[PDB]
Design an enzyme around this catalytic site. Structure first.
Site, short mmCIF file in Angstrom:
data_model
loop_
_atom_site.label_atom_id
_atom_site.label_comp_id
_atom_site.label_asym_id
_atom_site.label_seq_id
_atom_site.Cartn_x
_atom_site.Cartn_y
_atom_site.Cartn_z
N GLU A 50 0.87 -1.19 0.00
CA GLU A 50 0.00 0.00 0.00
C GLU A 50 0.90 1.23 0.00
OE1 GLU A 50 -2.39 -0.17 3.60
OE2 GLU A 50 -3.70 -1.78 2.81
N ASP A 61 -5.21 8.40 10.50
CA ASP A 61 -3.94 7.78 10.80
C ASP A 61 -3.59 7.97 12.27
OD1 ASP A 61 -2.87 6.73 8.16
OD2 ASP A 61 -3.47 8.78 7.62
#
Ligand SMILES: C=C(NCc1c(COP(=O)(O)O)cnc(C)c1O)C(=O)O
Ligand SMILES: C=C(NCc1c(COP(=O)(O)O)cnc(C)c1O)C(=O)O
Ligand SMILES: [Cs+]
Ligand SMILES: [Cs+]
Ligand SMILES: [Cs+]
Ligand SMILES: [Cs+]
Ligand SMILES: [Cs+]
Lengths: 249, 399, 399, 249
Positions: A50, A61
């Site tokens: 990714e 995140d």
């Protein structure tokens, strides 16, 4: 027709293992060293990479990834640098998908970004702040440029939204997050045969093995960034341990 | 209903402005707030509960004051101030907050969170949670905690936890990022009391519905005091709550010009501003498709203004739609223009406005010159300036 | 009215409360102000101007709010808050100032002076002088400049000059002494805008007449909301203007208990209080014969309170009369009691009161425990706590 | 029949001159020193001594008197000390009146203070914050204990109030202040033959003589206090100079 990532998962299932799915942000700690780290992941047995696109306002995140994406933006990282990372990964024999927040894709142009990503050998796009409800342009670009489309589901997803999110996904469904992770994977398995990747703050062989019992792909991100910050050798060692973890015997 | 978006929250068509550019992890709680609001917005008992707090607790209606001593700086136009500065807590924010806190209790939520820039939304939320017995956590950028410290101290006296945000620009946009993080982790028990006319559906519409009262009252008052509808209605524009609040009642009055005034900071040519419509472009940000300050790659450009409340690089989607449609103009006002107006209002009318609000006053003065003698301009005076007194005193060499 | 003094300013005939205990040098201007008040109080143009400003500028009426979360802390009585905190400038002071400042202009005076303790009277006076374009000078004790600094900055932004007074206790009594010295010298061009219901005639009566609006609104509002007149109406007492304003409309309702609460500082037995009725005696001070804290030769004893607004050793003569008649009871409230009530009101109702008003709330809580369940108690919430947030946060360890 | 200070002003009027009226506050720099200073005024040629009662909030006093009275109060001066000073003055051959704010008189008791002032040999009371309008108790006590009642007039006094104040006064009228002092004395002469004392911050021989040309008495206070602060011999010298001034006009 068959999804771009179908053969990797078909192959993993035939060897009694999960796919190891590895995240690194482009440009951390700078553009060249990140490309070297992503190559290393290919060489150390990541089935799928990714390639993260750093974003100024990365709402989902955790702090390890957020600090790293900040450093990357301070270093001058561009969206085209993620397309280069995809190119280098493809050249090294790897398989890349891109993970990005949606606005950089809108700014680039959705059709243009799908085209250029496909050209670079990219196999798909993971869209953590795009839900199928807003994905009309993306669905059309995805079918046109033969790119997979990986939407997220969560333990809180209603029955109705989980089914619509699975139906809209190609390649794999990302089960983002304790019995929540196996329960969520089992809800996707009740409605569909699509592969399910599971992210769970994995940082050891033991944890990847636990997840590989029920999930088709084990997703690792935070621990790879932490390992890379220490050094490229530490990244190789960890990826190695995780590659052993995903194989069941 | 006429100006409302579709059930997905889009203004101007099924893929136009607004929507829900959010993670799937927030959709369960977003759908829950949407369903709760759809139910309560047509309950007379809910609107009674809201109206009763508006009258007896918040002291509505706010008056409309003709600021006759500004006239000579406004081309001899007639500036009328809609005095949201007199609301409980000192701004329009309390209108929205009362609606949402009532809603959070109707939903069975025990915890409320909110973002704040100027601290006026933070104080209002803390205030409502104290009144209704809800736990309160407020997120505020660390640069804003320092320049709006009066409001930090207030929130704490009201029983709220204030969390200083050190990420990014340490201003409003970064407080919002933190609030959304809190919400996804605490969705079971937590209501997010969103402070401006932005965000994913239902917030732009809900915030605006709770601020509509400003323009409803003003439309009656200006007809009463001036004998006609105004030539213009104007407001400052951060994310857009006070402006949409006062504008909404006039949207179908085709002779009424609507003008929004955004913070231009050091100037739009400097790269230190928050002039989202003047210098920004369409994009997805904080849950909506709208305008934002963004670079060639789509990264948010950090905003700057002397005003903590207007220091936001985005704007709400209904304003994007009203801009695109030609119904509202949006214009830049600099720090200096705002501060000249702030001082003029203090000296001339004895009203200390919020620095946010002084952007609107500055714009009205300019509009007055454009429209000329006798033009009737209603100005939303969104808040008072107690929080800004130290900043203003320094600007004017008064300590 | 039946409650008015004679033409000399005396209440209750031969006990002799009020009057004019001033030098001959002040009488020409005192007579001038008295006569201008008698003329303008029956002039429709004056009453119309005052009315327009009360509504459109100051935001009257203030609401009456049933603070239901206080009830369990008040013996299950029903506490209703008369929200003078929502007025323009954030206290009742503006009521008296609008009247007197309009009157200064009618007299052709070109300069206005005033004393201030908490800075609310200062800010209000400065506000009206900005509005009407009068030179303004505010005298303020040096200890009050330091503990109410927010208000000093507001005054100066409003275009008022502030003179810090360093004599005696450097609190309100000493600011008043300086302003009287100024008026003596500048009488032909200067109007003295006296801030409390004290001083020589006409100030006690005039100030009360401009504050009467509070009690008239309150009497109507409580009948409308509660269905009857209150069991008690209470207020804090400095010199006595907010209390007399709320009390006056109830004077002839014999079932309505009236209670004034005065500042007791560290406690009445400590010699650091401002408990004028509790510990003072009759004497002449600041132009009236009323009660004051004084020693055995009649030297003024210095007051102390955590509240700058109640830190005054005197009290107005109409209260002295009301005390003598048994119509109003006056009771001491300590710094500690007031601060507990401050924090309680913050947490229960989301209202940050003035530390002055917090004394009244504290007394109301006690009176609620006496009167019991269902008793209706109207409390004048005289001001808000912006000015006191530093002090209160320091008191509660919120830094 | 006649006022107590009447034969003092007559003796001045027969020696072709004005009366020197001298103020000192009791208790400055302490009580014994203040009495020694007041006695020295009698010996140095003051026809009348104003004995000041220090007050905590003295609205009318200028900076020199205000600060001396504040110091007198920090030193513990009591009202009874004033009555002790009056008695010392009278025993020395002097003629004393008291200058006081009204609250100290209310607290003592108006009748009781008049009684005790007269028993000390006091001749009158100067009442700078008592107008005749409030003077009922004092007028009664003044008639009974045979004390002059010196009220103040001002440049600003209306004609009506000037007449009322003059009428209410026995002994003299204190005209407190351009060409404004002579104009005020003129307005008192137009309605009454009562002596007028003028206080004008007199510092010098020349200033005292100027005032003696139109006024029956010359009042000096500030300057006497300033002299005492330097020392007792400076007071004597200054008071000697002023005694010469009032004989000039
Ligand atoms: C962002 C915040 N305030 C914005 C604000 C604004 C701008 O926000 P709008 O949502 O555009 O109304 C205008 N006026 C006042 C008095 C304000 O406080 C805040 O207080 O959290
Ligand atoms: C002395 C001053 N204020 C007194 C005050 C008081 C006491 O003054 P009253 O005249 O007793 O009402 C009560 N409440 C508030 C909010 C106040 O500010 C002043 O503002 O100069
Ligand atoms: Cs109101
Ligand atoms: Cs903006
Ligand atoms: Cs400056
Ligand atoms: Cs002014
Ligand atoms: Cs008092």
């Amino acid at each position: 027709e068959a999804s771009r990532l179908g053969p990797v998962f078909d192959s993993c299932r035939a060897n009694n293992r999960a796919a190891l799915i590895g995240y690194l942000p482009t440009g951390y700690p700078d553009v060249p060293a990140s490309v070297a780290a992503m190559t290393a992941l290919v060489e150390s047995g990541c089935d799928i990479i990714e390639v993260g696109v750093p974003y100024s306002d990365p709402g989902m995140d955790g702090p390890t990834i957020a600090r790293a994406t900040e450093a990357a933006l301070r270093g001058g990282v561009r969206v085209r640098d993620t397309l280069a990372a995809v190119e280098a990964i493809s050249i090294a024999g790897g398989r890349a998908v891109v993970m990005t927040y949606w606005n950089p894709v809108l700014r680039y142009g959705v059709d243009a970004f799908a085209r250029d990503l496909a050209a670079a050998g990219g196999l798909g796009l993971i869209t953590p702040d795009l839900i199928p409800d807003e994905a009309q342009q993306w669905l059309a670009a995805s079918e046109e440029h033969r790119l997979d489309r990986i939407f997220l589901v969560a333990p809180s997803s209603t029955p109705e939204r989980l089914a619509a999110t699975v139906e809209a996904s190609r390649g794999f469904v990302y089960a983002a997050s304790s019995q929540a992770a196996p329960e969520l994977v089992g809800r996707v398995k009740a409605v569909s045969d699509i592969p399910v990747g599971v992210g769970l703050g994995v940082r050891s062989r033991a944890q990847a093995a636990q997840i590989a019992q029920y999930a088709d792909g084990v997703i690792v991100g935070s621990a790879l960034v932490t390992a890379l910050t220490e050094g490229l050798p530490r990244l190789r060692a960890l990826t190695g341990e995780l590659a052993a973890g995903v194989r069941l015997g | 209903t006429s100006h409302d978006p579709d059930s997905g929250g889009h203004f101007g068509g099924p893929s136009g402005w607004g929507g829900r550019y959010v993670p799937e992890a927030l959709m369960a709680v977003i759908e829950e707030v949407t369903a709760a609001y759809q139910k309560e917005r047509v309950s007379q008992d809910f609107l009674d509960d809201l109206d009763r707090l508006q009258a007896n607790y918040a002291g509505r209606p706010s008056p409309l004051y003709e600021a006759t001593r500004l006239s000579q700086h406004a081309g001899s136009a007639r500036i009328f101030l809609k005095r949201e500065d007199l609301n409980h807590t000192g701004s329009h924010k309390i209108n929205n907050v009362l609606g949402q806190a009532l809603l959070a209790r109707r939903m069975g939520k025990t915890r409320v969170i909110a973002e704040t820039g100027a601290g006026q939304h933070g104080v209002a939320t803390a205030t409502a949670c104290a009144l209704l017995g809800l736990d309160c956590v407020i997120y505020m950028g660390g640069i804003d905690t320092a320049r709006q410290a009066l409001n930090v101290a207030r929130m704490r006296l009201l029983g709220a936890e204030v969390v200083a945000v050190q990420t990014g620009s340490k201003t409003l946009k970064d407080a919002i990022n933190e609030a959304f993080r809190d919400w996804v982790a605490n969705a079971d028990n937590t209501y997010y009391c969103f402070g401006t006319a932005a965000g994913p559906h239902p917030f732009p519409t809900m915030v605006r519905d709770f601020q509509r009262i400003i323009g409803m009252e003003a439309r009656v008052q200006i007809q009463g005091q001036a004998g006609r509808l105004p030539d213009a209605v104007v407001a400052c524009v951060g994310g857009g709550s006070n402006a949409i609040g006062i504008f909404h009642a006039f949207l179908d009055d085709p002779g009424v010009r609507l003008v929004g005034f955004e913070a231009a900071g050091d100037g739009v040519e400097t790269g230190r501003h928050a002039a989202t419509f003047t210098a920004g472009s369409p994009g997805a940000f904080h849950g909506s498709f709208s305008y934002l300050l963004q670079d060639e790659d789509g990264q948010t450009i950090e905003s700057h203004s002397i005003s903590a409340g207007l220091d936001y690089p985005g704007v709400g989607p209904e304003h994007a739609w009203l801009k695109e449609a030609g119904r509202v103009d949006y214009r830049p006002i600099t720090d200096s223009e705002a501060m000249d107006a702030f001082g003029l209002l203090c000296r001339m009318e004895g009203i200390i406005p919020a620095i946010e609000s002084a952007h609107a006053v500055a714009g009205a003065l300019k509009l007055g010159v454009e429209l000329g003698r006798g033009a009737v301009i209603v100005v939303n005076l969104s808040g008072r300036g107690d929080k800004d007194v130290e900043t203003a005193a320094k600007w004017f060499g008064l300590l």
